[PDB]
Design a protein around this ligand. Structure first.
Ligand SMILES: [Zn+2]
Ligand SMILES: [Zn+2]
Lengths: 64, 12
C-alpha cells in the first residue's frame, strides 16, 4: 500500500481522533504501550507534552 | 493510540 493509501486500521490519531491513520502513520517513537500515541499527517506538526509524551520524544513516518 | 486488540488467540 503506497502513500495516500497507508491506513493503519486499529491505530487512532490522538490529536484529531481519526481511529485509523490513513495516508501515512506518524508513530510516537518514545511513548510506551500504555500511552501508545500516534498522529495523522494532518496532525504530526503537533509537539504536545503529557506525563510521558514530550517535546523531547520523537515522531516517525510509516509508508506501509 | 492503539484501538485494535493484540492477537492473543485465547479467552475471546
Ligand atoms: Zn490527526
Ligand atoms: Zn509521542
Amino acid at each position: 500500500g503506497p502513500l495516500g493509501s497507508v491506513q493503519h486500521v486499529g491505530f487512532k490519531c490522538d490529536n484529531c481522533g481519526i481511529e485509523p491513520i490513513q495516508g501515512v502513520r506518524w508513530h510516537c517513537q518514545d511513548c510506551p504501550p500504555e500511552m501508545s500515541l500516534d498522529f495523522c499527517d494532518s496532525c504530526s506538526d503537533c509537539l504536545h507534552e503529557t506525563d510521558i509524551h514530550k517535546e523531547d520524544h520523537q515522531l516517525e513516518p510509516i509508508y506501509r | 493510540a492503539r484501538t485494535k486488540q493484540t492477537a492473543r488467540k485465547s479467552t475471546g
